[PDB]
């Protein structure tokens with residue numbers, strides 16, 4: 001059975017830092033990009049939509065624009081790794097990685113964001 | 127692009143009734159069952175997992191046992207229809223129909239359940 005796995009289902013990140021969250025999927029021999037779909041979302045916000053080798057970068061939800069990318073090198077290793085730069089308080093929540101590759105599955109990853117009072121105070125009022 | 131569509135994204139149903147929630151996907155001519163995956167969930171509870179022409183009967187969340195089925199005949203028409211019988215208050219929430227068929231997509235459907243006072247003591251949990 002096609003199974004997506006996550007080495008970590010919980011990440012704790014500091015406000016302003018970068019994060020890479022990972023979901024693994026089975027690749028026998030070499031990856032066939034044309035058969036691969038990778039989708040990342042958080043709470044109904046679309047983050048990544050990689051379809052048959054072509055990424056839709058522009059349909060990323062505006063809160064992630066210019067901050068989120070799929071590490072394409074890692075796909076050939078069977079690793080769907082989502083990198084988010086400049087982590088914000090609004091980035092905390094439950095992410096899902098959905099993968100179709102001759103089989104389909106998804107997993108959840110929880111992200112917690114620590115932040116100092118100044119950042120928390122802005123988030124609190126914005 | 128492969129697109130799953132829902133004619134309705136909202137269902138309002140009565141406690142104890144039956145519901146059929148529908149999601150469509152494109153099927154050009156003859157369905158290739160071996161390439162089709164249909165998955166239904168609500169709040170990450172597995173309802174339907176139809177893979178390689180076969181349901182996985184033991185993977186269904188216990189709260190849907192005996193009550194939820196995918197109507198297999200509809201699949202060749204490009205209709206992934208989830209039929210839920212004997213609707214309970216716990217069935218209210220946001221459902222997702224996830225389809226892989228030479229392409230992948232999903233849609234969300236909201237279900238509201240109306241119920242009399244007596245049933246409404248789901249309040250006691």
Ligand SMILES: Cc1cc(CN[C@H](CO)C(=O)O)c(OCc2cccc(C#N)c2)cc1OCc1cccc(-c2ccc3c(c2)OCCO3)c1C
Nearest residue numbers: 001003039098099100104105106165224225226230231232
């Ligand atoms: C067939 C299938 C089996 C399974 C069961 N997977 C296990 C292994 O973990 C097994 O077989 O024992 C599945 O599991 C989802 C799930 C996740 C987490 C917890 C539970 C539980 N309990 C269930 C989801 C699933 O279908 C998920 C699915 C189905 C169809 C399409 C997509 C999909 C993929 C990529 C997409 C997409 C949908 O739409 C937008 C564009 O990108 C997905 C994720």
